[PDB]
Amino acid sequence: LSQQWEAGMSLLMALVVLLIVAGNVLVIAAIGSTQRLQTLTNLFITSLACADLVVGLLVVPFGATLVVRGTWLWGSFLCELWTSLDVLCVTASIETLCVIAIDRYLAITSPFRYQSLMTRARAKVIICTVWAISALVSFLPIMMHWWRDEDPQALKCYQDPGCCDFVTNRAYAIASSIISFYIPLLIMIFVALRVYREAKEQVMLMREHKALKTLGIIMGVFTLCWLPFFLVNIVNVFNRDLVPDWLFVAFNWLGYANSAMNPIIYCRSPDFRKAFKRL
Amino acid sequence: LSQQWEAGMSLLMALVVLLIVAGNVLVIAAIGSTQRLQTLTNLFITSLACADLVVGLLVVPFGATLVVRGTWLWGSFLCELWTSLDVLCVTASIETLCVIAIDRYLAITSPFRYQSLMTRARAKVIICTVWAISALVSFLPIMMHWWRDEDPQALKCYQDPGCCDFVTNRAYAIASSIISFYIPLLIMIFVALRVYREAKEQIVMLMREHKALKTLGIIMGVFTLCWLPFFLVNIVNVFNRDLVPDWLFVAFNWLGYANSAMNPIIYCRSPDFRKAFKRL
């Protein structure tokens, strides 16, 4: 029965890969190549389609090989690389997002200065800084093996090339989550809020609102996709065996789904669909 | 190294599957749902997008499992089913095609009667007959084990559920090919020819007719190039056994599988089609 699953869901995983590599890049295509979609707020969506893409390019395909065959064949050097990219795509996703939600308070209480401060020139650097931070924070602490837990259970998984199963020390399993998930989340939900308070206070701004709600969705779905997983890892610290280990995988995949989910939340803009058709 | 290939090209095979199941069905979509594409000559393309589709649906996915893992896990009952569908899609493809090329002599020396004889009502039955014949010929002789060769080499592959590797008796490896490949091919190439002779005689606007014609020519060209090298082999299978390496024997059945994913993308040539492809 096991070999029927081995070749059974490999095809399927490959299909979801196509959802990502296709969808995100058709998004990227209609973005970079159309003027009406080149509004700044879609440049953070340029970056994000990017992160989501590297997800469905480098992280998912290699990321099956552990589920399909049950183990890692790709060498532990690559093990490190793959894991740090699995996280990088994340800190890039959330952090870029939080940049969006921090921008759109400036499309509200500070609209007058939209083009003065935020320039299609000035946001590029900001995404770049998001990826110097994403890169620093994700990629340094993994290569530092700041994530090595002395215990032999994990010790054997650090020394055995065939386990890329991610097991970390007490406090990296704290720092990791605080920095790369929690504070930016609570901050961009916090910041989404005042924006959606000022949005109630309101010739035609409706376009503004149909384009706004669809941004709201992104962070909603994101939070629902990567919260259940980044909620777990805390219980990982508090009670170990209260947390079944198959779920530990089910949620990192549930989150992978975000990537393929994104381009299809962009089916909501006709600005976009018009460039999607002729595309 | 072997487990890196096992999971290495499984993804990829799945991707080509997507080429098929997607492409053929987007073809089918823009066909059935648009008037301008509902011309009879595209109803044979309805059927064909169909065969190609069942190919990229039932035959290819199961058809990997033998290449990926090296063997058949799906039971020999299913082994039979899968193989007979692997062939059925073929006899449907060629035979439907030959129907096309036999039609378009009637779009030439007999244009006057186009709507009198050929009716969007009358070609449906014809495709149907193509699939009573495809079904009879492909599906009977396999369930008859008319393909069992007594020899123990193959005997073990018939009794072992794990070998769906297709090995057949002397004369089924003759009948199979004559009927389901050769005569219909030589017949539809034969019939393509006189049509492309009458097509030269021309030189208000028939050019549309010609740009829509050449793109039909392509289909049978590519088809012949895809399934000829494979259905050329199986004859040398009869004449000289070890002169024919057995990895090629697979490489060509896949090269041919490619036809399916190749088809919808030869339909990128009609704007009638692309217009229904965009809004689609």
Q: What is the domain-level CATH number for residue B265?
A: 1.20.1070.10
- Give how many domains chain B has, as a whole number: 1
Chain B neighbors of A7, CB-CB under 8 A: 10, 64-65, 68-69, 73
Are B7 and A68 a contacting pair at CB < 8 A?
Answer: yes
Q: Where are the beta strands (DSSP E) in B52-111?
A: none
Give A7→chain B minimum CA distance, Å.
Answer: 6
Both tokens assigned to B142: 């396999």
Give A15→chain B minimum CA distance, Å.
Answer: 7
A222-242 core/surface letters (b: 16 or more CB in 10 A; e: else): bbebbeebbebbbebeeeeee
Chain A neighbors of B69, CB-CB under 8 A: 3, 6-7
Resolution in Å, one decimal place: 3.5
Both tokens assigned to B165: 């590797």
At B162, which helix (H) or strand (E)?
Answer: none
Q: How many residues does chain B have?
A: 280
Q: Are B67 and B13 in contact (CB under 8 A)?
A: yes
CA-to-CA distance for A39 and A45, rounded, in angstroms? 10
CA-to-CA distance for A127 and B172, rounded, in angstroms? 66
Give the nearest partner residue to B279 out of A11, A74, A277, using CB atoms: A277
Enter the DSSP assignment of B35: S
Both tokens assigned to B185: 């091919």
Q: Are A130 and A96 in contact (CB under 8 A)?
A: yes
Q: How far is CA B42 from CA B50, B66, B98, B193, B221, in A?
A: 12, 34, 14, 20, 18
Burial of residue A159, with CB atoms counted within 10 A of its CB: 0-12 exposed, 13-18 middle, 19 or more buried: exposed
Chain B neighbors of A10, CB-CB under 8 A: 7, 10-11, 14, 68
Residue A160 CB: number of other CB atoms within 10 A? Answer: 13
Angle subtended at Cα A174 by Cα A172 and Cα A179, rounded to the nearest 5 degrees: 95
Which domain covers residue A189, as residue numbers?
Answer: 1-279
Give the nearest partner residue to A65 out of B7, B13, B17, using CB atoms: B7
Q: Are A104 and A212 in contact (CB under 8 A)?
A: yes
Both tokens assigned to B84: 């007979």
Both tokens assigned to B24: 């053929």
Give the nearest partner residue to A11 out of B4, B14, B73, using CB atoms: B14
Give the nearest partner residue to A11 out of B17, B73, B74, using CB atoms: B17
Q: Are A69 and A13 in contact (CB under 8 A)?
A: no
Q: Are B91 and B134 in contact (CB under 8 A)?
A: yes
Chain B neighbors of A20, CB-CB under 8 A: none
> Which amino acid, one-letter code, is at A120?
R
Angle subtended at Cα A233 by Cα A228 and Cα A239, rounded to the nearest 5 degrees: 115
| DSSP H helix total and E strand total for chain A | 13, 0
